[model samples]
Target: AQNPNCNIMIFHPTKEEFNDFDKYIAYMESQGAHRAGLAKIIPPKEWKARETYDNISEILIATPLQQVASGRAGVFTQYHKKKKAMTVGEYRHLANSKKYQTPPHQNFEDLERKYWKNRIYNSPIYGADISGSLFDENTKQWNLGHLGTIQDLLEKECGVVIEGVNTPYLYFGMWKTTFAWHTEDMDLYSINYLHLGEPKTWYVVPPEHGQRLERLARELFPGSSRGCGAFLRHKVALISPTVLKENGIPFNRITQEAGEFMVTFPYGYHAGFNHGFNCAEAINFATPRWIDYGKMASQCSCGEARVTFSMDAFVRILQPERYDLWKRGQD
Candidate 1:
């Protein structure tokens, strides 16, 4: 018998356990879940996704889909700057249409599909920030934002409403539409939930091996890695798991089905692709020590663009909170 998939940890929590998501995750962190840098949570079968999404805003949101450069091994290396623009509904329609199985979608063999890259195998409108309207308004049962988690310190204490950071984001996925390898913004923790549709496959590097993976990327992609070693944050660089394992880095694969939640630890490098058409929502949260990570994150810009929110302002509010925890000292 073979057991290749046992390297990563998984959890099946009862409804009560799910109720106190933060507590459960906090315990997990102490129990060494954070060491692995990623975990899969299977919510109780009784807990189901909302049957309806009344938020018409999803359809109205303007989205730009990319023309992915590579699609082999579920590894999407990069994308061309020229993107297709349309509303969410338009792309959703195409992803769900019978046209997905038509000529343009077929012939996916990467080598023979060279000339076929025109509008073929285009990526989905992924990672759309929807923090504008609270996810709790609809998916109250599984709202990560309102989970009452201490991770919400960024929003509750800072009074900041940064999309995908304090708030949440919506993701649409089709086959071969992949999110390149990268860690969460500002190196904060990330939680993603698959609302419905096919499962998502995630590849992650544990916290300890994160640097090893980064070094490997720099060695392999000299062109991009030259200008700045910070190319990983661009969401355009992807290295196969084979290369990662060959480099003596630990690589864990987690395939998340609907109703499952995936958590990425601080500075944990995680990336993956969809099995097919699927919808997901993700957000960043900070734990007690997340402020410590924020110190480094606060200094760095996310990608080439400058961050809109000020980390120092948020850090100011958490200073007393951190001191309070230490005051209890000598446990």
Candidate 2:
């Protein structure tokens, strides 16, 4: 109600941990992040061998045709090499000189429409040339990049590369914006990579709060589940209002590099937009829903799981008398 709490918490996870698919899968599994029957695609103990890295790289990079990484992703810069300019003002005037309304910004209309229409399926536009794989806001269509570069990137960055598959699930965007409540009907666990700037805040509310925002969203669109079961997992609370500014705890701060995270949040109410200029990020959503159980199920696409040992879960276990909400949800 009163802005949950203007605070955040910070936890540093190593990129290396993610690189080891097995270990990564195991950790998530131990926390009940996966489904009932699926075992982790990779095994933590199997990764100890030197060649395990190569195997993982091969599987991720070569096996699948394409994969999607949802939410905010990648690097963001305030530079434009095409028009030899920078900033929206410069781009607008440049487009005006070219005789176009609103400077033909990459998919401007499509972006606006998606903002008003649907929140989950919109794609992102790259800063440079609209070429390569990206979403055209004007056309409202998704353009995928070449297979080689995409595969290489997955191998290099995620250690899970694919060759010929289509990875339409990965998406990114900038200018702190919110996605009205919606559910993803896919076969992968989704992750949101967010980068918040000064005064820019993100609110991850429970489905209960979605009602507060749903009515506002519906005035624009009918039959919209804008306010549904959108709830933040216990893990996300690391940056929640509870312990954000508490003594000795770390909070989020704009760093030279944008923050990269792989979180499997429950289908809950979560919205993020910039409070200030220059606050931006690119989010990539990976498909093949990841289970918190340290397992990745090709099936069990969109079910919910409660991470038993999650920071919040652990705290709840400690204060069993007070963690009624959390305890009840887990059961």
Candidate 3:
């Protein structure tokens, strides 16, 4: 009865039930609910009903993409810095009034830029999936997408499964900045779906290119960031020989019904950041919360360095008098 692929069996609540039940607050506060202990827990259905989450920004405003990227700081940082509370009211205000847009485009490339770490290149704009985690400071908004377990996905109309990423993060990044070569904090398993315009040309480097990178890294990439932990260091001994055979390692272009491709980028350095309006449709949910680290790491020298990268830090900075805000989530 055993088969090559059918090995694992999993169970999940129906997506409709997942979204509808829990009566949202009704279920969250009900007796014996396993979720009672978590901070800000809410029923998934009630979470999705907010009006702000319904519409995606379609009007292309006239502003430099960089200006738009810079402008987002206040909502994620200073505004919260003073407010001390992450409320539905604030998110509603931010989403409305065209507050999330930037200056007019200066070039064709500017149109494809990602405003925040959670914004995808090509996708509908839904509020962050409550199941993911806290808001992202960079985007000044919740991370929106299909997430949680396969059982969670079974009820939805469309979804994805990212197998290898230990920690998954969904956010947007400004394309203008020349991000130095780096690996993701978690494995990068994603699907690039271009919904609006022409397709983009992505450059993918082989794993071997990383070893040669060390000697000239600084001169070439300068302030290199991580893409994933140094894969080149650990797998060097066997990679080359295995690569020669082209037997052990496999690379394939799997098709998606939507205009997207399943990408498993285990290692390498590349740049996809730009100022055009694009949304990344995938998750980077690392086991230990690497995506949270991405936002938390920039809290020290926030002056002009743009500190609105982590939602937790933004909440902390929001109420300077209330220094304990950061500690609020600890419980």
Candidate 4:
């Protein structure tokens, strides 16, 4: 059942829409992205044409945990603190270095066993990634479905290129691998596709309830909004759907299955955990209607905002489209 303002909408693309992939993307942008619905994309086909970690067996199975640092390609803690001492590029290089070795494994289970042998269940290492090496010589053929959409054209036109963070990143997680509540950078839209692994549980708070939740966050974790990239970089106490429902805040939960795509709207606060061992890839993009949200996020994120899509650039590129939408009163 949809609430007054629905927060989540799940849909399967029709054959016609799926054949002309752009149609599906356009529809999602209109209904999900514009309306700020947390859209779930369940394609009929496996779309195995898109890359998954299984193709890169050695790296996916044998890479040791020591190679990637805690905050670089791998986030192993509940809290996140932006590293000031080391440059982000340096950390990225270290995470991608081949100095790391792989343990001997006879099978996938052997690899999984090695990966989780020394892990702690309570407050375990949350997020890990092989995104740095995803484009290496061994595995360059992998393609995401969104690569061919107009969103990519719009992103390139606006000079928005998210290199090390979202796109080309391979997220690895075990049980209790958690990411605290936060929105995408500069309030951009994000699409997360589960490559092949365990399910991920997601909790989303709509933009309408975002301010109210932030107020509650401040009351619970004082000084959360005092610094640049404040709430996002710091770990705030988890406010569950039960609590939010009791407090009159609109929120919803979705347990994302493997092969399903989770599309998050601009400025929507989302957080979740990987149920078990699994791998996922995510990327960010922007649409014409997202200009206002981008501006608001820039103002709210203080000086720490990474404004990927500049409104000035977008207005010039998407000028005609905006007018056309306005003429039809769709803008």
lDDT of each: 0.62, 0.28, 0.27, 0.53
Q: Write candidate 1's Cα lDDT for 1-331 as tens digits.
A: 1223324678888877767666887867765777777888888877765655545434544445654565443233666343456555665666667644223434323412332233234544443454443354565455765654333566665565533335567776765566778877557788888877766778888776778888888877777776554778666777666567677878887678877888888888887666566678887777766766665542222235233253334433544444333233212
lDDT of 3 by residue, 1-331 (tens): 2212211111123334445321432332233221111112222322222233333343222221121111121111111012222333333343233434334665443443322333322222222212232223332112223333322222131242222212233222222222223333222223232322122323233433433444333232222224312322211111111132343322111112222322323333333333322323443322111233333321212122221122333234333443353344233
Off by over 4 Å in 4: 1-4, 19-22, 29-36, 50-55, 60-77, 80-121, 127-129, 132-166, 227-230, 233-237, 299-331
Off-target runs (Cα >4 Å) in candidate 1 are 1-6, 53-58, 70-76, 80-89, 97-127, 130-141, 147-165, 297-331
In order, what is each prediction's RMSD in angstroms? 8.0, 17.5, 16.3, 10.4
Angstrom error of the Cα, residue 148, model 4: value is 6.2
> Residue pairs in steric clash, candidate 4?
none
Model 3: residues with Cα > 4 Å off, grouped in runs: 1-54, 58-180, 195-199, 221-258, 273-275, 285-331
Top lDDT hit:
1
TM-score of each: 0.74, 0.31, 0.30, 0.63
TM-score of 4: 0.63
Using TM-score as the measure, name the better of candidate 1 and candidate 3: 1
**Superior candidate under lDDT, 1 versus 2:** 1
Model 3: lDDT equals: 0.27
- Please give the distance, in angstroms, between residue 158's alpha carbon in candidate 1 and its true position after superposition: 11
